[PDB]
Design a protein that fits this description.
This is part of a larger assembly, with chains A and B. Chain A contains no helices and no strands. Chain A is low in regular secondary structure. The relative contact order of chain A is 0.10. By secondary structure, chain B is an all-alpha fold. The chains are: A little secondary structure, B mainly alpha. At the A-B interface, loops of A face loops of B. Chain B: It is found in: Cell inner membrane.
């Protein structure tokens, strides 16, 4: 009737590096 | 004081930073080349490369002030006539 399917391990997704990137704040206009 | 910003370049992790292709020379590169060529010429003549006092730069600046005194004497004796 219906063929069997086996519960394999899925292929790996391309990883999402969830880092918190930090930006240095700009300078302050001396005057 | 005023909280300035030093020169920074992080890593890229992106296919654009490998694409610059330009050779343009800064002030720091030409000053570093002046320093290296004044350390080599004080390293095959003075035979010490500590670069405390460089006498070759003293001699070359002496003859350059000679040529500059020539040029100022020319512009001083031209305006006389």
């Amino acid at each position: 009737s219906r063929l069997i399917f086996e519960h394999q391990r899925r292929l790996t997704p391309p990883t999402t590096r969830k880092g918190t990137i930090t930006i240095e704040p700009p300078p302050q206009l001396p005057r | 004081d005023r909280r300035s910003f030093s020169s920074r370049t992080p890593v890229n992790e992106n296919p654009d930073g490998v694409q610059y292709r330009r050779g343009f020379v800064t002030r720091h590169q030409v000053s570093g080349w002046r320093f290296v060529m004044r350390r080599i010429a004080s390293g095959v003549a003075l035979h010490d490369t500590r670069m405390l006092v460089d006498p070759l730069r003293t001699q070359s600046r002496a003859v350059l002030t000679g040529a500059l005194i020539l040029v100022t004497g020319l512009v001083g004796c031209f305006i006389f006539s």
